[PDB]
């Protein structure tokens, strides 16, 4: 498949061809609003491996965030606030420069009957998935939360506040031990 070629080409990020593409695309986006609807992703391989599919129900948005609450987290929060009726699934980096960093976020509309009847995507329609970025359930949010296995995440394996509450509580049984 061609997607392997796309991934390999994207591996050499500092190639003169990708440099030209990035500097052209950033200049083109500089003339557009901060957040706007994207007709199609500029990195089809990344979106496809992130779960995006070219079918009625998916939406691609490009958002610009000031350089220097991670930048990806801020972008996800902004797109979720603007796209209140859509659910943020994942996002990927698409460009950067000395002033701004650009990320592309793919959204799925749970109201569209195509998604509702999609056995592989109807899970997002559950109300528990509302505003995934708000609770940091996205890929970037989970990574920032330190959720992982091993000694490197013992203090933040699942919930930094939960462990503090557990170690601060006084468990007393009916018959004292």
């Amino acid at each position: 498949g061609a997607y392997k070629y796309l991934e390999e080409l994207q591996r050499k990020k500092q190639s003169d061809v990708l440099r030209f593409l990035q500097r052209v695309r950033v200049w083109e986006y500089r003339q557009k609003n901060v957040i706007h609807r994207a007709a199609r992703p500029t990195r089809p391989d990344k979106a496809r491996r992130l779960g995006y599919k070219a079918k009625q129900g998916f939406v691609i948005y490009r958002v610009r965030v000031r350089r220097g609450r991670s930048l990806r987290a801020t972008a996800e929060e902004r797109v979720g606030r603007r796209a209140a009726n859509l659910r943020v699934l994942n996002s990927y980096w698409v460009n950067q420069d000395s002033t701004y960093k650009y990320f592309e976020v793919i959204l799925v509309d749970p109201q569209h009957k195509a998604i509702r009847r999609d056995a592989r995507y109807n899970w997002i329609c559950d109300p528990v998935h509302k505003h995934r970025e708000a609770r940091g359930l996205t890929a970037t949010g989970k990574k920032s939360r330190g959720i992982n296995k091993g000694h490197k995440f013992n203090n933040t394996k699942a919930g930094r506040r939960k462990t503090w509450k557990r170690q601060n509580t006084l468990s007393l049984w009916r018959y004292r031990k």
């Binding site: 070629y5 390999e8 190639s15």
Partner: peptide, 24 residues
Amino acid sequence: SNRTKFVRSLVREIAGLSPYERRL
């Protein structure tokens, strides 16, 4: 995989050398 190696070589020839690689 031979195909993966071929694709990697093709990408290497297409992308040329990186600015830091060009110093060599």
